[PDB]
Design a protein around this nucleic acid. Structure first.
Ligand SMILES: Nc1nc2c(ncn2[C@@H]2O[C@H](COP(=O)(O)OP(=O)(O)O)[C@@H](OP(=O)(O)OP(=O)(O)O)[C@H]2O)c(=O)[nH]1
Lengths: 101, 19, 90, 403, 65
RNA sequence: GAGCUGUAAGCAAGCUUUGAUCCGGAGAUUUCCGAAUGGGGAAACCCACCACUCGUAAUGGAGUGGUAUCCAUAUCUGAA
RNA sequence: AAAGAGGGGUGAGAAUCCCCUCCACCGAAUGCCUAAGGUUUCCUGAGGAAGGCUCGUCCGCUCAGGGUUAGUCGGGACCUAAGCCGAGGCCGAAAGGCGUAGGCGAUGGACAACAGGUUGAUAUUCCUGUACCACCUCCUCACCAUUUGAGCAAUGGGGG
């Protein structure tokens, strides 16, 4: 899984092509990730605790992780990742630069 | 339980009983 | 052996509560327990004097969920009956 | 109803840890008590009272697992609750009743505590809860507007307010007041006395003179709960320069700490008789130390005709007996629900009063357009009507299960 | 907690904490069966703690022999 | 190197960057039947003896370890 | 294989379900205990899609709770019959077959509790009164003798 919870993701593929978002939930068992603002879907539900009103509700569906690239911090353009020991813990060096994440 | 039934009816009238 | 694992869990029922009012307590013990050691274990843990221990054991109910046809585990219900002028058990 | 919310907030997370864990350890009680001690200190509880309270609870809480291994944590909570209860006075301390009417009650305190307002609140309580016939008296001549303030409250209660203006001594006012009360058969005489911002000599000289001529059966200090330990000190000074028999704590509706309430007894031995809970005249309750202790610890204790009776008894018919207010205090400890009907309950009542007598007798007889018209008259199209019918069906199922 | 169990002294207080711990577990099961226990991971963690404090005893004995 | 309490859509509660769940090597526990081996038995059961501990005033009760047959070696005793 | 009929009651709905009142059947049984067997079908509260040779609100079906209490009853901690296994043994291409001591094995022998009460479901089992059998000694009482020995009996004879 080349992304983490709290990334600055620019999506690649789908109806939502090319918009920003922060990851709130990654599901690495299924290789799906939940980026905010993408796959806004309408769930119908009759019960709701903490004051039931029922009604349609607008939530975010997870997307597959291969529709996801992180962003290089210097240029802002999406790039692939690499791994390099920075004298201690391993960090994700973005390609086309030397900085991390 | 008459008192419990009355309390549940009051709660359902105030909002709703759990089903 | 340990007096704690003799008594597994209590039984809370209307019949059980009527026996509580008539000062005979009920417990569920492990499947290889003994009448003497149920008496010894309840006297050891709760510090009360007993008159009798009345032990039966129960078969397994057959429960199904969809395709699955299993059986509930067996239980050994053990009623202890305390003496007159003894401490109660909570 | 009101008060102590901040101390509760603090205590109740440390209480959480112990209650869940049945096991009692030397380290568990020590830890809970360190937190309890910090919470009482931050609530401005008297310092000696804290150190004695932490000692007596901790001593009982480690003989209690020896006391009982059954529900051990819920036993530790019961000890804390019992000690909180004694700390705020053991039990409800009721109003004195003289052998011969009238019972003379002297209200004292410093300016701004709430004397004048509380005088009116107490008269109101005496008539509504005890069916008495009280008389208010205007003994504070030293501010202007003081007399007119009391007279105004008197006119809302339909109760006399004795006054001889501001050019006559309060000793004389009290004397004549009590004699008129004898002649006209008044049960109680409530004297609203003078007071500046701070105690002085010529306050206490006057109050002792009034006590003398009036021989009161009760002398109540009215004191502002939000002043913390300053209220405990005002109490100590009044109880020593004249005799206090009681204390009325005002403005609990703004007091989140509770220092004064937890400290008055232990420092002055004067009991707390009433709590003021607001600006209105009907915001006075007897002080019930059990129920406040319980509060601080989060611890509690014809279909149409039936719906109309439930709406009458739930919306404006609030007031239970047999410990119904005690178990239902704070919404019954909140009940894990954060939603109240309020305007939803008002809309439910409006939807309930949208049908004929035959429809109220038989709720299932309404056709689809039959309560489409009722929903048009109510304001919710189908949603409120069908929710009300689902609630009626659920109540019928619950009644069938209970019967 | 396993480093604490190694670092503490050898013979008897592990047995005393097993015994004392066992009583709490016995009390804890009773509370779950009667149905007024709030937290249920306490049963799991007390069972894991009893297991690790018994296995430090057996590891100590098989190291001693 | 950040999600995890399987299968399984569950919040009654909790654990983890003082490094969880997951993966490999070596260890510990491994009830009861089963060649089953203390004696029996109709598979998952019943009843014992000896030694040492727990408890009772003592009997009752419990825990732990031994107790099958044949063979090999060694020791003692060696019938008509 | 055989007898119901009407009035109430519930329900959305009935000849079929519940109550009542008459009528009819068995009565060396179609009654009451209890084996082999079955395994939760027993009781209470809900359901009517399937099962019910029709319907069904009903159940031996479906769902959730509950219910089987022993010193004396039956079997073990006692015995043996037929029979079965069988240390050593005797045979036998191999497996195996037979058989002594020993043991297992009731359908038999021996053996201490009964009559009243109870709940929706257990009753010589729970409660009340009155008993009985085996064993033990912190104890109380009497007797005998602590080697010219009181008392006990043994896996052995004998009667039973
Ligand atoms: N919330 C609340 N207020 C109470 C209570 N009891 C009294 N008060 C308020 O305290 C202020 C002083 O009351 P007084 O009745 O004049 O007291 P006093 O005779 O001792 O001077 C009053 O309002 P005030 O002068 O307008 O207050 P402020 O404007 O000075 O703050 C009064 O409304 C109570 O129980 N709860």
């Amino acid at each position: 899984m080349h992304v983490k919870k709290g990334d600055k993701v620019m999506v690649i593929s789908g109806k939502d092509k090319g918009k920003q978002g922060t990851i709130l939930a990654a599901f690495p068992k299924k290789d799906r990730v939940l980026v905010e603002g993408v796959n806004m879907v309408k769930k119908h539900s009759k019960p709701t605790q903490a004051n039931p009103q029922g009604g349609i509700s607008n939530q975010e569906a997870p997307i597959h992780v291969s529709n996801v690239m992180p962003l290089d911090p210097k240029t802002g353009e999406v790039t692939r990742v690499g791994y390099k020991v920075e004298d201690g813990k391993k960090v994700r060096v973005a390609k086309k630069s030397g900085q991390v994440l | 339980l008459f008192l419990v039934d009355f309390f549940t009816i009051i709660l359902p009238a105030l909002t709703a009983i759990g089903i | 052996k340990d007096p704690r694992d003799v008594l597994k869990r209590p039984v809370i029922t209307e019949r059980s509560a009527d026996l509580m009012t008539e000062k005979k307590y009920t417990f569920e013990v492990d499947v290889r327990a003994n009448k003497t050691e149920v008496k010894d274990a309840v006297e050891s843990i709760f510090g009360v004097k007993v008159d009798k221990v009345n032990i039966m054991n129960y078969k397994g109910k057959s429960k199904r969920v969809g395709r699955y046809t299993g059986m509930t585990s067996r239980r050994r219900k053990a009623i202890v009956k305390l003496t007159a002028d003894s401490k109660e058990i909570e | 109803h009101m008060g102590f919310e901040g101390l509760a907030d603090r205590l109740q997370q440390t209480i959480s840890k112990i209650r869940g864990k049945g096991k009692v350890s030397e380290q568990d009680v020590k830890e809970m008590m360190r937190e309890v001690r910090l919470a009482l200190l931050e609530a401005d509880v008297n310092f000696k009272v804290v150190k004695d309270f932490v000692k007596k609870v901790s001593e009982r809480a480690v003989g209690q697992d020896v006391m009982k291994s059954l529900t051990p944590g819920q036993q530790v909570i019961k000890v804390v609750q019992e000690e909180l209860t004694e700390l705020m006075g053991g039990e409800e301390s009721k109003i004195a009743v003289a052998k011969r009417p009238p019972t003379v009650i002297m209200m004292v305190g410093l300016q701004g505590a709430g004397k004048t307002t509380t005088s009116g609140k107490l008269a109101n309580l005496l008539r509504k809860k005890h069916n008495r016939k009280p008389m208010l008296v205007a003994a504070d001549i030293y501010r202007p507007a003081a007399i007119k303030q009391l007279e105004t409250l008197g006119k809302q209660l339909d109760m006399p307010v004795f006054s001889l203006g501001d050019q006559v001594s309060p000793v004389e006012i009290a004397k004549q007041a009590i004699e008129k009360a004898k002649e006209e058969h008044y049960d109680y005489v409530i004297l609203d006395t003078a007071g500046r911002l701070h105690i002085d000599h010529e306050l206490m000289d006057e109050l002792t003179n009034v006590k003398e001529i009036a021989n009161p059966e009760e002398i109540f200090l009215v004191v502002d709960s939000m002043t913390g330990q300053d209220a405990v000190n005002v109490a100590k000074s009044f109880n020593e320069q004249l005799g206090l028999t009681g204390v009325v704590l005002t403005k609990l509706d703004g007091d989140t700490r509770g220092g004064a309430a937890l400290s008055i007894r232990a420092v002055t031995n004067t009991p707390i008789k009433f709590a003021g809970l607001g600006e209105k005249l009907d915001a006075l309750e007897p002080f019930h130390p059990e129920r406040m202790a319980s509060r601080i610890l989060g611890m509690g204790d014809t279909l149409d005709d039936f719906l109309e009776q439930l709406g009458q008894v739930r919306n404006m018919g609030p007031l239970d007996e047999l410990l119904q207010m005690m178990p239902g205090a704070g919404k019954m400890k909140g009940l894990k629900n954060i939603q109240v009907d309020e305007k939803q309950l008002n809309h439910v009542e409006a939807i309930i009063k949208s049908m004929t007598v035959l429809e109220k007798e038989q709720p299932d007889i309404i056709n689809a357009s039959r309560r489409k018209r009722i929903a048009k008259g109510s304001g919710t199209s189908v949603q409120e009507v069908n929710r009300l019918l689902k609630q009626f069906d659920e109540m019928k199922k619950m009644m069938k299960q209970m019967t | 907690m396993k480093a604490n169990e190694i670092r503490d002294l050898t013979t008897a207080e592990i047995e005393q904490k097993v015994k004392s711990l066992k009583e709490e577990l016995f009390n804890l099961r009773f509370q779950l069966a009667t149905g007024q226990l709030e937290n249920t991971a306490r049963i799991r963690e007390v069972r894991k703690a009893i297991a690790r404090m018994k296995t430090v005893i057996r590891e100590r004995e098989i190291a001693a022999n």
